[PDB]
Design a protein around this ligand. Structure first.
Ligand SMILES: [Cl-]
Ligand SMILES: [Cl-]
Ligand SMILES: [Cl-]
Length: 163
């Protein structure tokens, strides 16, 4: 584990991360997709061999020795707010189990269900709080990746408020 486990946020492409493993914001069919998923497919295409997995789950596939944890958040266009909230929390719990199993000291993670699966709503706080609920009990350094300047400031404020 990390000597003093921390949370950090960076505004840049997660395909350029400096962590020991990455979480993909995957679709259930293992397809190249859009946004984070398409960047992950371009950087680690080998990790999409048999990466299909249901909503609310995570499945890790190695690209060489680098682990790609494919985590499938719900598409809020298809789920109700109640059921989608439950599946989004579940996908993050599965990411925490995989990060622990892998024994890594750091992990790069995006906010699941905040892009094209958001159903047109701002889900920064919802998604980040489910991330904290799952990852708080792990000892890996967590680096959250985002692309929007206002989201970077809000995620950074939420991290600092708890310290
Ligand atoms: Cl970038
Ligand atoms: Cl998304
Ligand atoms: Cl963002």
């Amino acid at each position: 584990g990390a000597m003093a486990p921390s949370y950090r946020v960076k505004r840049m492409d997660i395909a350029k991360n400096d962590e020991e493993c990455v979480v993909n914001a995957a679709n259930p069919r293992g397809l190249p997709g859009d946004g984070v998923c398409k960047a992950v497919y371009k950087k680690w295409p080998e990790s999409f061999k048999n990466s299909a997995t249901p909503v609310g789950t995570a499945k890790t596939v190695m690209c060489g020795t680098y682990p790609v944890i494919h985590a499938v958040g719900p598409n809020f266009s298809n789920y109700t707010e109640s059921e989608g909230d439950r599946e989004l929390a579940a996908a993050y719990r599965e990411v925490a189990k995989e990060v622990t199993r892998l024994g890594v000291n750091s992990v790069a993670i995006p906010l699941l269900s905040t892009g094209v699966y958001s159903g047109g709503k701002d889900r920064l706080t919802q998604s980040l709080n489910h991330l904290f609920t799952a990852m708080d009990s792990t000892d890996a350094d967590v680096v959250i990746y985002c692309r929007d300047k206002e989201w970077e400031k809000k995620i950074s404020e939420a991290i600092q408020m708890r310290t």
